Amino acid sequence: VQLQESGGGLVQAGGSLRLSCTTSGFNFDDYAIGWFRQAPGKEREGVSCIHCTAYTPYYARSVRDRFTISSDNATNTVFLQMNNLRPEDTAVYYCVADATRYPYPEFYDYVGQGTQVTVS
Amino acid sequence: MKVFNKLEEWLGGSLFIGMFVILVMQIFSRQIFNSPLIWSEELSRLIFVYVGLLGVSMGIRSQQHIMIDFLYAKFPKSMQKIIFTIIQILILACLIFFLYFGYDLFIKKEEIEIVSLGISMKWMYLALPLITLLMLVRFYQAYSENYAQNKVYIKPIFILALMIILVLIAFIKPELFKILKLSNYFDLGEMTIYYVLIAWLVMIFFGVPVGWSLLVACILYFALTRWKVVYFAADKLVYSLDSFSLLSVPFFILTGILMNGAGITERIFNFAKAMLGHYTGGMGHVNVAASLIFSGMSGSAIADAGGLGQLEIKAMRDEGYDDDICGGLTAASCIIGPLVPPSISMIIYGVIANQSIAKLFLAGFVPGFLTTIALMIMNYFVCKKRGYKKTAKASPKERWIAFKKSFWALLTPILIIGGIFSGIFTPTEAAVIATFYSIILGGFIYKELTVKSFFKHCVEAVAISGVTVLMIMTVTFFGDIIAREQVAMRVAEIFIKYATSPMMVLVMINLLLLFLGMFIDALALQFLVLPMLIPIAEQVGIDLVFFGVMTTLNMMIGILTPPMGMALFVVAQVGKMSVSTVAKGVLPFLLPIFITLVIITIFPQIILFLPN
Ligand SMILES: CCCCCCCCCCCCCCCCCCCC(=O)O[C@H](COC(=O)CCCCCCCCCCCCCC)COP(=O)(O)OCCN
Ligand SMILES: CCCCCCCCCCCCCCCCCCCC(=O)O[C@H](COC(=O)CCCCCCCCCCCCCC)COP(=O)(O)OCCN
Ligand SMILES: CC(=O)N[C@H]1[C@H]([C@H](O)[C@H](O)CO)O[C@](O)(C(=O)O)C[C@@H]1O
Ligand code: NA
Ligand code: NA
Ligand code: NA
């Protein structure tokens, strides 16, 4: 199971970043995929996941209504569009996948390299 | 021994007195002179963790945790023993969960430091595995009694053997529990939360206590999906009690006990009976006015009933009033308690809904006055229809003697309501100052509160708050599970599909609450419907402060609906009258309460004025 991130870097307050995760090595539909966040000196926090919840994608309380997770199940890609980025979102975002479809992205078995997101 | 049988009593009482002293020292050292204490709040919360867990142990021993016996009571006695035995086994499983996953948290947090106290964040996590050892004792004793009354089926030596075997396995060879891991047998996919919900309702209607059923549901969910996460979610069982707002629950209870017991609730009644009582049916006006004045000190309707019902019914029956109205008005006027600040229902709502408690109090202030006015008008109409004789006016000297006697008491609401509104006191500091003032009143201005009596009041306040502490700390555990699975979003989609306008959503929520409160108690419902109804209300745009006031008023009606009404039972006990008579006599007074509910539902700007 391989996952590689794409996109990131530094933006201002409200830069509307677009993280991406191209993943391979499993069945895209049977595996719950998602993103979690680790701050520079804090415990990891789950952000979002698709295929985890039964009906709608799971969103964290502090990323709700301003983060949208989308699937691209033709090139096996997961996108996370972030809008209205507060200066408290400066962290590292890791793409994760897991065979158990439950909305706990910070405890998922597999994890990607991660990307730095800085908000100034 | 006996000092060990009465151990939580003298430990929780002493810790509660210490916490009270620390908080009052903080308040004085911060207000009287500018010298704030940095170590007061965190030390108080650290003490309160132990106090709450000791209260939970007392509740386990007394078997006084809230359950739903609507369908359990109807079972045949032969079939009523298997279910109770299974309930006891489930409680044992929950206690073992507590012990194991509290010891893990205690041993995993030896490096985190409490900055203000300069101590490790394990002395706060030591409480969960430690007090649980008492809970496993008090549980077994509580089981040994049940077998003496033919209420269980398993001899209480097999239960002891099972308990010690399970504890030894948990702390020696935990891997033997992997057989019970349900994820090795069932693969329900992403729709497991709806299988641990219908299995949580089956438990909730078979007589399992609410606090334990929530924990069993969490255990089932984490066993079916993935066990590895339950080590990190179990933290919610401890830091939920490390809340400064929650400290206002055992204090606002205590200030409702130190006034009935110190005789301060009779001087208020004398003042109300002197000022009012010479009107058309004025012995009901004194009832409602006494309830209104006492609602500024207490926060429970049952406390109001138990403290004023005998006096009110006696005063009303000394004037020829009928039994039905005597029992009905004194039950309908209870609900003014949990509406006017302080109130414990709104504190619980603010804890569950993460809302401000001061704003909840200010919002609920106005509906209390509206309900008081409506009850007075309905009582006046009823009395004038029945032609009750107007009582002679009190002399201008008695009306002043009663006021002069009950003068320092009347200043208690000004400390609370005028302290929170003015911003001088936070609700917890308001609770502490109110308790201190009640102690001064009953011990140094009225001279009716001893030290043994005060300690007994502290002990019973701890016991009463311990049955809500368990439900708080398990509903916090279950809420994150139910909120990551986005169940409330699906239910809200269904509700919007069936009810279009938001007003229809409010009407349907109110109808559901009215139907459920007839058979379910007002405390075994605030932890069952609110955790899922709050996110739906947030989604459909309903203000959460207004929603809290509305739900509190909707559930205070539920204690008067006579399939299951706590206020009716309390009034029947204190009035020496049948429950049926009270139930029939409260029907005329349900109408003004419904009118108040309607006019606050369709005029939300009435509620949200003082907060805004
Ligand atoms: C006369 C008849 C009377 C019948 C009496 C029945 C008695 C049994 C009742 C249940 C006992 C309490 C269970 C809940 C508390 C569990 C305590 C913690 C156990 C635990 O952590 O074990 C892990 C493994 O077990 C696990 O993986 C946990 C699986 C079990 C959790 C609970 C599952 C639901 C309950 C089962 C219901 C169905 C059966 C009912 C009989 C650790 O192992 P590790 O290696 O992962 O950790 C070590 C490395 N960190
Ligand atoms: C105070 C105690 C509780 C008060 C409320 C109930 C009072 C009366 C009790 C009787 C039961 C009433 C209905 C409640 C059902 C709860 C569980 C809903 C899930 C369910 O059965 O349907 C799911 C379908 O998902 C869907 O599309 C439907 C999802 C609906 C979710 C509703 C969850 C409510 C849980 C209760 C919270 C309190 C009330 C809040 C409104 C999964 O179907 P399945 O897996 O069973 O399929 C069976 C085939 N294999
Ligand atoms: C007596 C009982 O079982 N439940 C009652 C609870 C408890 O007194 C609780 O311990 C403190 O809220 O209080 C009420 O919610 C209240 O007056 O607001 C009414 C409810 O009927
Ligand atoms: Na009150
Ligand atoms: Na009353
Ligand atoms: Na009822």
Residue numbers in the entry:
A (entry chain B): 2 to 121
B (entry chain A): 1 to 612
Please share excerpts from the published article on this structure:
A single molecule of Neu5Ac is bound to the aperture formed by HP1 and HP2 in the central core transport domain. We describe this as the ‘inward-facing open state’ with the substrate-bound. The majority of the interactions are with residues in the HP1 and HP2 loops of the transport domain. Asp521 (HP2), Ser300 (HP1), and Ser345 (helix 5) interact with the substrate through their side chains, except for one interaction between the main chain amino group of residue 301 and the C1-carboxylate oxygen of Neu5Ac. The data clearly showed that the Ser300Ala mutant was inactive, whereas the Ser345 mutation did not affect FnSiaQM functionality. The structure shows no direct interaction between Neu5Ac and Na+ ions. However, we observe a second lipid molecule (Lipid2) that is bound between the stator and elevator domains only in the Neu5Ac bound structure.
The import of Neu5Ac by many bacteria is mediated by tripartite ATP-independent periplasmic (TRAP) transporters. TRAP transporters that manifest as two- or three-component systems consisting of a substrate-binding protein (SiaP) and transmembrane protein (SiaQM) are of particular interest due to their absence in eukaryotes. The second component of the TRAP transporter is the transmembrane protein SiaQM, which is characterized by two distinct domains: the Q-domain and M-domain.
